[PDB]
Amino acid sequence: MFLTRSEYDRGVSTFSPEGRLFQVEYSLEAIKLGSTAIGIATKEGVVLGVEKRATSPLLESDSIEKIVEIDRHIGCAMSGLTADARSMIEHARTAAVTHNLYYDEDINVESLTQSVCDLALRFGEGASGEERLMSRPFGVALLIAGHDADDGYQLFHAEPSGTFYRYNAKAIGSGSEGAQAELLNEWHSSLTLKEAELLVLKILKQVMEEKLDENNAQLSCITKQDGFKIYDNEKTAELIKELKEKEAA
Template identity: 50%
Template sequence: MEHLIQKVFIFTQRTNCLPIGPSSKFLSLAVCDLALSFGEGSDGNSSKRMSRPFGVALLLAGYDKLNGPQLYFSDPSGTFVRYKAKAIGAGSEGAQSSLGDSYSDTMTLEEAEELALSTLKQVMEEKITTTNVELARVTSDKGYHLASNEDVGAVLERLSTNVPAAP
């Protein structure tokens, strides 16, 4: 694992030299390549590579200056595809259907948060609470931000009272 962390550190240092920074697609490809190397031995010997990298599936969200918001899905084979909205994991078929029906490019961030949590609410077996779900935002001005339990609670409260998001 230490070897993988070193690769990420070196990659990050190199890409910071680019004049506008790396694109989300470029970063997604790098992460997919990294996920494929999870199966290598600790000495980096690819002849000891496992046939599959632990079944890793990732959703990668980012914002780049050229293309705006980006969302990529990487499957265990290392293949990556860009999506506007994507669900993975248990219940993903129903969640993906709901996202496909409700997502719009014109949604506000608050509306997108409500859609994400209402979709989870529909497909989760247990009741959705601030302790069993996390919400993160990726924006052009603040980058990545993990919402606090209070922020998640506020979105859940809006959902339960059917109060629309503030404009």
């Protein structure tokens, strides 16, 4: 039988005889579009990093916010369908704040990641017998870089399908497959913070169409002491020229 994918494709709630339903597997293909992202974790500091897809020379590129704050000790990224993000994160923070009421403490990081993943699952029944709120499972594949006392510095990969993972060095989006092999072979368990910011500003170079500058990229780094901050342009340009001064020698 050859008409297994041709007909069982479009309705969400149709098992195909191979066991699988497709309209979720296509949602996974969405975030393969968009602009890439990286997350590296450390005993000393978590770090992210993105491109920006310079589209026109007159836009004000502080606006498209592939990276956000979500709480004082958590921060996100996303390499997917845009508008379906701002329906996500205005829930995800809302738990962390709500949690600061019902329990008066900086929430853990995974529980937040479990509240999201119990939201995209609303093309169906959620955990507590809920019914439905949508029919368009959406591509906003996240990276939740955070800190909490039990287990230190973490990141995750939260996908629409619900299931997630505690990756240590991830890279999602269009430049993944060329990267996630490159980060496969250059992740010790004993790196620094700044032995990573330069790294993630080397893979990003080779993988992206244009050349690398401050304008077409940025990054962030939380810390248990300072918090989520999105670095500055002239600060980033410090690291870029620093790299070249390391390459030639």
